[PDB]
Design a protein around this nucleic acid. Structure first.
Ligand SMILES: [Mg+2]
Ligand SMILES: [Zn+2]
Lengths: 49, 53, 99, 49, 147, 147, 89, 1111
DNA sequence: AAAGTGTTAAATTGTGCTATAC
DNA sequence: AGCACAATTTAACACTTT
């Protein structure tokens, strides 16, 4: 998994910044941990998206 | 639930080939409105007189 | 120009199809309103699923079962009329009805 | 009329029932507006690709 | 002046709610509206009156017309919406995938209209590389060797 | 308006004789399959009924002509044949649509291409992909920006 | 009447059944409805074979012939974007 | 109050209420026992009017009888529909998968006229599905709920439009029946009339009026004012009866030979013969009340009479003149005004019984034209009716309604609240109603007539706002289908107690005061002017003599789920909507603690929802155990109540049911005797009480996320039990029979360790993703092996084993224990469908903890997923060392306008620790209007703030200043409500105080384990070879259109080409990429997508010569 | 003066579209 | 359901016979 980027996407994809590549790192649990600064670009809030 | 289905048939796994195949001969039939149709056949095969083209 | 259409695309032209073009694509005339058998669940002859016209249901086997291997390919079984070939050409051969 | 109470003092029955009018009309307009905007984005992408 | 009017009347609506969009995007959209002319008099070169032709092809057929008898086709510029311009495009495969698939497919077939696959909506359909970004020739025909 | 279609049939190598039909092509049977669901159930793909009705009324016309018939029965049969082929190509356009069991209209060949369900906006412009997943998101305030 | 009933035997099902099997299917259905009206309940296979002078192993085999194909192109849930063919592996 | 075993929950209510909350499930059950004709309804109809009450089934039989043919010599009559007893009991119906039913008996009677016959036979009509005690039906074992429907009532609707061309007003009418033809009387742009009948293009009035048989003097005589009518009588040109009849026939058919049958019988066969036009018993009330016809008459004639028709035209001609009143010959005068199509006096409610009645009517009408069909082909003397009757269409229509409809839905049960509010739901969509995309903005908004009938707050959030609502608390449904609402009438400024149930029509004729008005001990208002609601919805301020009605209570406008929010009037309506919609999605926990601060609606929404075992008659508990409670009544006999333990709900949640009485207790009638899923001591308990701080902590509670403590995982505070059901069936195939056995084709002996000797697993065996549950093996008939596999069989010596292996394995991502196995077999006479030898279901339990990604929510619309679960050592603790349990964010409070979640945070602290208002020298000024026994309270006391009459803002500030010390004398929370927290992670205190308190939070059913999906390679589709969709299959995430636009705008050509070819459609590229990845080579170039070659075939099958050219 | 008779405008019908993912 | 738009009619007109 090291240095193998993944594309993250959130519908609706309003502008071209709604698809962004990150590098991954294994995290215990079953929820994707998003960085708290890209949430403006995705327009994501953490109430169940 | 998932409900798998199949059109009745099979998929075989012989890797394809293109050099040794039993040999064939070509017949030619002629319909009523002057058309010509070429049909391959095996060599050990009785070539019939009439064919539904 | 390229009926197999494998990676060489320069244009793609549309147009009206004359009746000489429809009986040139086709591999035979379907003349019965039958789809499939009710007992043997095999496609009937000269119907909407007929092997003879559209292709073999099983890979490299004819209808009667006389030819069943890849050593015979391209040939047509003289007793049933089904060309022994792959079996996924049933999703690409056409057929026509004469009005 | 209008509503002379605040949300810290709490509203009365009639002022709350009056307020529900605009508070539901805004939600219905939000749904229909985000329905209409995607059609405009689609036409704008298609005319200018 | 119609460019000034369209840019100002769009940017007024976008400024009244506190949204900053630079004018070059609205100019890119507006440029795709004024691309065509309508025909007044046909001259004698294959142009039906009242038809909307591209400005470059019109000036090409008015360039050729000084040879073989001078009668220039006369046409005024037109301004048309995004649906009307998006539907009246060269590609027949890109216009059928958008709106009115039956009535686009049925008059592409009468005209025997061909496609050339140059936009990035038909290369998406047929599975080819789009002609933008790393898909154009000068970027994907790079040869790499060690110094 | 008439010069448009007359010049379309005049300019190219087209001919209007392709507007009336004499042979009807039949889509290959793997695009209108008959799938045996488990439990011994069968599912047909709704184009088989229209093809069956076309070849049914065609066989009945071919029998009525050889048998010798008055003009009323033959004209009624030809009108039924015309309505069957029109129901095959584009259902629900002229007259009332052909329904199956449940008073739902059958899906013709034209209904495979139109709409936001057509082959065009459903299976050509956007597809489902392998090697993908989805999940809920929570906040990650110790990560770097690229992680 | 013979022409109409023979046409309804021949060209009314997507899987074509011969007219003797359509005859025994009509006879089985009529006898089933009559015994239902006499009994006020649904009859049984071994009960149905008693009326029709056959084996009960024949009755369910006859009943598993008259099942008509369910159309692949109908919407299945209330969310109308899905059809049946999008759920068959 | 007035419940014998209730917990003593003190109330902050400053008012008393005259009318108590009704039997909340009376919208469902009272409409079914009208359809049956139970003696309860037979009494209760006579108890309020209704001189001759007729049942739901009697209304169909009395309008079908008598069956008479054209011969007129034989008649068939149905009468007296009675019911037999139920065949199976309730719980057994849910066990063996049979539906709750009862046989129907109807006395038939055949009378021949030529000789005289009376053989009146008793005919079994069918097995009619019965409604249970809780207002649910049981269909095929499962439990369904029939939902009410909102439709416009059939009648005469007037309207007025303004066209911008000539700037005048056009008044139109619409006479819309049920099952008939339409007719409108418009007024056109040029001065004319609009008499388009059955939607055909035009007519003038005088064509229809002289077609009706009216001379040209009477048109000028009755329509004498009528400046437009004589104008049309000049410009019409058609004179006579026949000359208009040919015009009507030629415009209506069109183009048919005019006869003398089609002249005088067509008009009487479209609006006057009661088989093609019948506006129902509602519509004949509406026209009689609108036009002011013979109201002093109990008319039952559902056909359009002629007189009303011409009265309609007069109404229109007095509307486009400027008028207020109109008197018709022989009736009372009426106001002249346009009607609203979305008023609640024009929007009736087809309840549960009327939908059943419509299905029975449309089934009997198929049954009707078989009877007179065999009234001719049979020979009399004698045909009993029985020969005559064939009940097969009626049972087919009933069975086709109860399943396969959109108005008979699966019961929404994952708590008692969603079960209660799935009934009492008023939906506008469905068959005969409007659509979801063809619905405008007019029906979605709240009309001002919704007060007391539909809740403005509770409605769905998606694309269904306004289309689905729920009934109020005190509402009630009229016999016609309108919605009533109680009011207290006030005479001479003195409020009496004569409670009148008004409808939405006659509410506007009076004026209605406000409930929180200062009544002074007799009925007199204190202030001389009262707040009041006028006719059009206006909010006036009127002196206290014109007031003639008052509300029976506050919270009257609000539903059942909305009335369980403390401090409702401090939240915005969007957040109150979300709070009412997030209470019916909470899961049942394993402990279910009652709320520390609530409203008064918890105790009544639990004993009426039916998920609580209630003692029937007053007895004394003889024997209690976790399965059963045998009580001994005062008169002889005993009664045993059987608790349902660990039953699966419809949505996977648990339905545990435990007693709360000991083995010597004395009970009373109606007393709660066993708790339910989400109940505690008989009242609703959806979540738990948790200590909350409102500080933002280190960016883990960032933008609506919630962080928790680890105490809730260690002590099982938010642990739920989820039960899944897996089903398999061995059928008869064309090659033999599928067998359920341990003998499985080629597989290890390690994966057969839990299966017993007859297939299925053992109860108690722990399974995981991939384990075999039911060992099932199907015959395969024949196929021939590859040469490599035939060599591999000959080496190791293993047979071919021609039977397949289709076992039942658990789906991907699930695990848990095994509760129960239910197996039905053909060999043991069980009821299974045709060609099914065996049918086995296996239930799997799973005890889910709380985890990050799960969705919690409060009562006030606040919500958010868990982003972090801190250990108990690094968590902000108080001065006691008590750590807090959740940490909510600050920045979500002020901008969402739901600060009621702060107020219950404050009161929840007081109710945690208890107050003592020291009135040692006098009661203080804030507590002047408090009740007694709120002056002091022991710790952990449950209080109750009702909805619009609760704790004021000036009394929370008083109770916060006396907040009795914990164990040592130590006040942990000062007067502002904030406390001084230490830092659990660094140690030093936070520099400023922080609001702490006790919030009531609920664990929603949006868990992470149901949402996470991944796919490398799975099943592909049939026609086009794209992957499937959804977690039930494997399915891939849809890379649609806007994602393609984003990747094109990036400039990434290769990722787009990879996502669109070798991941979806390139059929030879798919396995080539997999081979190249496994062997470790480079990914090959993509080919052509196999969904494009399908398009060329569907274009060539449209007769289009699509050809691809090279260069 | 009637009676058509063809050319020119308001009424009149039909076609197409209406967000995104689970 | 509506919003737009382009194709296809009642009717409104002067012009020319009768
Ligand atoms: Mg959100
Ligand atoms: Zn053969």
């Amino acid at each position: 998994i090291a240095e193998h980027p993944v594309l993250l996407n959130r519908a609706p994809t309003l502008h071209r910044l709604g698809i962004q590549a990150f590098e991954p790192m294994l995290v215990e649990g079953k929820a994707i941990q998003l960085h708290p600064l890209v949430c403006e670009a995705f327009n994501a809030d953490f109430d169940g998206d | 639930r998932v409900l798998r289905g199949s059109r009745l048939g099979a998929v075989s796994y012989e890797t394809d080939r293109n050099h040794d195949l039993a040999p064939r001969q070509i017949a030619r039939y002629r319909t009523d409105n002057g058309e010509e149709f070429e049909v391959p056949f095996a060599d050990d095969a009785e070539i019939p007189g009439t064919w539904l083209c | 120009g390229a009926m197999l259409d494998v990676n060489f695309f320069d244009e793609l032209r549309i147009g009206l199809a004359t009746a000489e073009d429809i009986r040139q694509w086709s591999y035979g005339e379907v003349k019965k309103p039958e789809t499939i058998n009710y007992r043997t669940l095999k496609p009937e002859k000269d119907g909407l699923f007929c092997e003879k016209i559209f292709g073999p249901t099983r890979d490299w086997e004819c209808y009667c079962g006389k030819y069943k291997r890849v050593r015979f390919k391209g040939i047509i079984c003289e007793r049933c009329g089904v060309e022994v070939t792959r079996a996924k050409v049933r999703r690409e051969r056409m057929g026509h009805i004469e009005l | 009329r209008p509503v002379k109470s605040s949300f810290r003092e709490g509203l009365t029955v009639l002022e709350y029932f009056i307020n529900t009018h605009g508070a539901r009309k805004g939600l219905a307009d939000t749904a229909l507006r985000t329905a209409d905007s995607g059609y405009l984005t689609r036409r704008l992408v298609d005319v200018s690709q | 002046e119609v460019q000034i009017h369209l840019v100002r009347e769009v940017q007024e609506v976008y400024r009244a709610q506190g949204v900053s969009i630079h004018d070059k995007h609205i100019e890119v959209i507006v440029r795709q509206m004024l691309r065509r002319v309508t025909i007044i008099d046909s001259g004698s070169t294959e142009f039906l009156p009242g038809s909307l032709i591209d400005r470059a092809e019109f000036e090409a057929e008015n360039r050729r017309v000084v040879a073989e008898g001078g009668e220039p086709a006369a046409g005024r510029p037109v301004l048309m919406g995004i649906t009307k311009a998006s539907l009246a495009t060269d590609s027949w495969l890109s216009a059928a995938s958008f709106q009115e698939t039956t009535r686009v497919l049925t008059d592409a077939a009468i005209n025997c209209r061909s496609d050339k696959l140059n936009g990035l909506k038909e290369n998406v359909i047929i599975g080819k590389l789009i002609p933008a970004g790393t898909g154009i020739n000068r970027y994907r025909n790079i040869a790499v060797q060690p110094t | 308006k008439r010069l448009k279609v007359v010049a379309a049939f005049q300019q190219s190598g087209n001919s209007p004789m392709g507007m009336v039909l004499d042979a009807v092509p039949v889509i290959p049977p793997e695009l209108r399959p008959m799938v045996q669901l488990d439990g011994g159930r069968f599912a047909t793909s709704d184009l088989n009924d229209l093809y069956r009705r076309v070849i049914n009324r065609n066989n009945r016309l071919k029998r009525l002509i050889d048998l010798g018939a008055p003009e009323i029965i033959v004209n009624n049969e030809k009108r039924m044949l015309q309505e069957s082929v029109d129901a095959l190509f584009d259902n629900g356009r002229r007259g009332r649509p052909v329904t199956g069991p449940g008073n739902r209209p059958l899906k013709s060949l034209s209904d495979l291409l139109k709409g936001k369900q057509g082959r065009f906006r459903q299976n050509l412009l956007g597809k489902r992909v392998d090697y993908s997943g989805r999940s809920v998101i929570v906040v990650g305030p110790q990560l770097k920006l690229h992680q | 009447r013979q022409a109409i009933t023979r046409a309804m035997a021949d060209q009314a099902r997507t899987i074509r059944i011969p007219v003797h099997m359509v005859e025994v299917i009509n006879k089985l259905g009529r006898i089933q409805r009559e015994l239902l009206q006499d009994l006020g309940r649904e009859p049984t296979p071994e009960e149905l074979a008693k009326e029709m002078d056959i084996t009960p192993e024949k009755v369910l085999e006859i009943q598993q012939y008259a099942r008509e194909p369910i159309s692949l192109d109908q919407t299945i849930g209330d969310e109308g974007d899905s059809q049946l063919g999008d759920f068959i592996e | 109050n007035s419940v014998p075993g209730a917990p003593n929950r003190v109330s902050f209510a400053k008012l008393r209420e005259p009318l108590e909350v009704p039997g909340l499930l009376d919208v469902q059950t009272d409409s079914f026992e009208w359809l049956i004709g139970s003696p309860r309804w037979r009494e209760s109809a006579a108890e309020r009017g209704d001189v001759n009450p007729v049942g739901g089934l009697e209304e169909v039989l009395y309008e079908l009888s008598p069956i008479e043919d054209f011969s007129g010599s034989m008649s068939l009559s149905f009468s007296d529909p009675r019911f037999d007893d139920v065949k199976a009991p309730v719980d057994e119906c849910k066990d063996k998968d049979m539906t709750y039913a009862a046989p129907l008996f109807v006395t038939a009677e055949f009378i021949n006229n030529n000789t005289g016959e009376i053989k009146s036979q008793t005919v079994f009509m069918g097995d009619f599905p019965m409604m249970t005690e809780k207002g649910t039906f049981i269909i095929n074992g499962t439990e369904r709920v029939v939902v009410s429907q909102l439709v416009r009532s059939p009648g005469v609707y007037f309207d007025e439009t303004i066209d911008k061309s000539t700037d005048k007003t056009l008044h139109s009418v619409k006479v819309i029946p049920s099952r008939g033809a339409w007719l409108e009387f418009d007024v056109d742009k040029r001065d004319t009339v609009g008499v388009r009948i059955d939607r055909k293009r035009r007519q003038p009035v005088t064509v229809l009026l002289k077609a009706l048989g009216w001379t040209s003097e009477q048109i000028v005589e009755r329509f004498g004012f009528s400046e437009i009518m004589r104008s049309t009588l000049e410009k019409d040109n058609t004179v006579g009866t026949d000359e208009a009849l040919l015009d009507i026939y030629r415009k209506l058919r069109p183009g048919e030979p005019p006869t003398k049958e089609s002249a005088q019988t067509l008009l009487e066969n479209l609006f006057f013969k009661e088989k093609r036009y019948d506006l129902a018993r509602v519509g004949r009330y509406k026209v009689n009340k609108k036009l002011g016809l013979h109201v002093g008459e109990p008319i039952t004639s559902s056909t359009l009479t002629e007189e009303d028709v011409v009265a309609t035209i007069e109404y229109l001609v007095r509307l486009h003149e400027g008028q207020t009143t109109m008197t018709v010959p022989g009736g009372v005068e009426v106001p002249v005004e346009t009607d609203d199509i979305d008023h609640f006096g024009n929007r009736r409610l087809r309840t549960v019984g009327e939908l059943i009645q419509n299905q029975i009517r449309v089934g009997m009408s198929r049954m009707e034209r078989v009877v007179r069909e065999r009234m001719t082909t049979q020979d009399v003397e004698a045909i009993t009716p029985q020969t005559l009757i064939n009940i097969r269409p009626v049972v087919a229509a009933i069975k086709e309604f109860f399943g396969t409809s959109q108005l008979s839905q699966f019961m929404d049960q994952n708590n008692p609240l969603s079960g209660l509010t799935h009934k009492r739901r008023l939906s506008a969509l469905g068959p005969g109603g409007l659509s979801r995309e063809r619905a405008g903005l007019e029906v979605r908004d709240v009309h001002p007539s919704h007060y007391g009938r539909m809740c403005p707050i509770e409605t769905p959030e998606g694309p269904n706002i306004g289309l689905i609502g729920s009934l109020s608390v005190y509402a009630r449904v009229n016999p016609f289908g309108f919605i009533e609402t109680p009011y207290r009438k006030v005479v001479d400024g003195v409020v009496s107690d004569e409670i009148v149930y008004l409808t939405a029509d006659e509410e506007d004729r009076h004026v209605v005061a406000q409930a929180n008005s200062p009544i002074d001990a007799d009925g007199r208002f204190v202030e001389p002017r009262v707040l009041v609601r006028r006719k059009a919805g206006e909010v006036e301020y009127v002196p206290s003599s014109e007031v003639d009605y008052m509300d029976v209570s506050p919270r009257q406008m609000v539903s059942v789920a909305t009335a369980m929010i403390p401090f409702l009037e401090h939240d915005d309506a969007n957040r109150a909507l979300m709070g009412a919609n997030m209470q019916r999605q909470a899961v049942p926990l394993v402990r279910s603690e009652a709320p520390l601060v609530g409203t008064g609606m918890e105790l009544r929404a639990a004993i009426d929802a039916g998920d609580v075992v209630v003692a029937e008659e007053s007895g004394v508990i003889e024997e209690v155990s976790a399965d059963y409670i045998t009580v001994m009544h005062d008169n002889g006999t005993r009664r045993t109540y059987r608790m349902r333990k660990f039953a699966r709900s419809n949505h996977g949640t648990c339905a545990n049911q435990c007693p709360i009485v000991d083995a010597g207790d004395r009970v009373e009638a109606g007393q709660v005797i066993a708790d339910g899923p989400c109940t505690d001591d008989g009242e609703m308990a959806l979540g738990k009480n948790l200590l909350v701080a409102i500080m933002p902590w280190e960016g883990h509670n960032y933008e609506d996320a919630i962080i928790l403590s680890n105490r809730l995982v260690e002590e099982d505070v938010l642990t739920s039990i989820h039960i899944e059901e897996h089903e398999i069936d061995a059928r008869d195939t064309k090659l033999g029979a599928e067998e359920i056995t341990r003998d499985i084709p080629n597989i290890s002996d390690e994966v057969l360790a839990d299966l017993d000797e007859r297939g299925i697993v053992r109860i108690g065996a722990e399974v995981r993703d991939g384990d075999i549950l039911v060992g099932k093996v199907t015959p395969k008939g024949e196929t021939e092996l590859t040469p490599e596999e035939r060599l591999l069989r000959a080496i190791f010596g293993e047979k071919a084993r021609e039977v397949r292996d289709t076992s039942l394995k658990v789906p991907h991502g699930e695990s848990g224990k095994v509760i129960g196995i239910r197996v039905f077999s053909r060999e043991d006479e069980d009821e299974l469908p045709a060609g099914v030898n065996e049918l086995v279901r296996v239930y799997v339990a799973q005890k889910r903890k709380i985890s990050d990604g799960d969705k919690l929510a409060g009562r006030h619309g606040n919500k958010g997923v868990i982003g972090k679960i801190l250990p108990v050592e690094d968590m902000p603790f108080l001065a006691d060392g008590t750590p807090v349990d959740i940490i909510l964010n600050t920045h979500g409070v002020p901008r969402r306008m739901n600060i009621g979640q702060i107020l219950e945070t404050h009161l929840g602290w007081c109710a945690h620790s208890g107050w003592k208002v020291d009135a040692a020298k006098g009661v203080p000024d804030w507590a002047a209007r408090l009740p007694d026994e709120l002056l002091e309270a022991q710790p952990n006391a449950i209080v109750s703030t009702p909805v619009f009459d609760g704790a004021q803002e000036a009394e929370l500030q008083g109770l916060l200043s006396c907040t009795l010390p914990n164990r040592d004398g130590d006040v942990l929370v000062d007067a502002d409500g904030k406390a001084m927290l230490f830092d659990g992670r660094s140690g030093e205190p936070f520099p400023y105080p922080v609001t702490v308190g006790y919030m009531y939070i609920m664990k929603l059913h949006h868990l992470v384990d149901d949402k996470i999906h991944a796919r490398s390679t799975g099943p592909y589709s049939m026609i086009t070879q794209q992957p499937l969709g959804g977690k039930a299959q494997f399915g891939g995430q849809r890379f649609g259109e806007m994602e393609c636009w984003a990747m094109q705008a990036y400039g990434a050509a290769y990722t787009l080409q990879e996502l669109l070819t070798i991941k979806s459609d390139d059929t030879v590229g798919r396995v080539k990429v997999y081979e190249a990845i496994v062997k470790g080579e480079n990914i090959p170039e993509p080919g052509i997508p196999e969904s494009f070659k399908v398009l060329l075939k569907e274009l060539q099958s449209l007769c289009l010569n699509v050809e691809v050219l090279s260069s």
